Design a protein around this ligand. Structure first.
Ligand SMILES: COc1ccc(S(=O)(=O)N(CC(=O)NO)CC(C)C)cc1
Ligand SMILES: [Ca+2]
Ligand SMILES: [Ca+2]
Ligand SMILES: [Zn+2]
Ligand SMILES: [Zn+2]
Length: 160
């Protein structure tokens, strides 16, 4: 089959955060990114209290048990896993740089919707308006959900 998901009710658990934002502000920053995908297809992300989730999220510095480490004060803001089970679906954020709700540091919202996109089964599209754009592409954080092609993409994974 395809390596993407066999169910539409996915699980999530946090284990770490950025210093620049509080835990509630980071949950509140991702909530907007979850909804965008739950607008493109009938899926949902259910936050757990007891069991290693489909999607586990953490902040890590350089080597972290991936042959692809973090890179420090620029470049890779966030690297997600592809869909799977174990490391699969788990999304990793860089602790060597700076996060916020604005343009100076890294907009956790603008970064997050793209990385959730990878834990689904999607790839870097590079399309002049797409969300999986490999460059930290600046979308207006005002109901913008996905641009377009990212919607036809996720429809192919969970089923229309
Ligand atoms: C707007 O969302 C983005 C978030 C992080 C990056 S990244 O620089 O961390 N990067 C890894 C990744 O898969 N993130 O989604 C792609 C990089 C090759 C530009 C790029 C875009
Ligand atoms: Ca997992
Ligand atoms: Ca980085
Ligand atoms: Zn990793
Ligand atoms: Zn990416």
């Amino acid at each position: 089959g395809e390596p993407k998901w066999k169910k539409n009710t996915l699980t999530y658990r946090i284990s770490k955060y950025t210093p620049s934002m509080s835990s509630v502000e980071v949950d509140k920053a991702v909530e907007m990114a979850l909804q965008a995908w739950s607008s493109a297809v009938p899926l949902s992300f259910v936050r757990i209290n007891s069991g290693e989730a489909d999607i586990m999220i953490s902040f890590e510095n350089g080597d972290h048990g991936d042959s692809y480490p973090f890179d420090g004060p620029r470049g890779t803001l966030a690297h997600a896993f592809a869909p799977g089970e174990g490391l699969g679906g788990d999304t990793h954020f860089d602790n060597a740089e700076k996060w916020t709700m604005g343009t100076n540091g890294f907009n956790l919202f603008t970064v997050a919707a793209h990385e959730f996109g990878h834990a689904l089964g999607l790839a870097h599209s590079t399309d002049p308006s797409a969300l999986m754009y490999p460059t930290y592409k600046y979308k207006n954080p005002y109901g913008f959900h996905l641009p377009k092609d990212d919607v036809k993409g996720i429809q192919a994974l969970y089923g229309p």
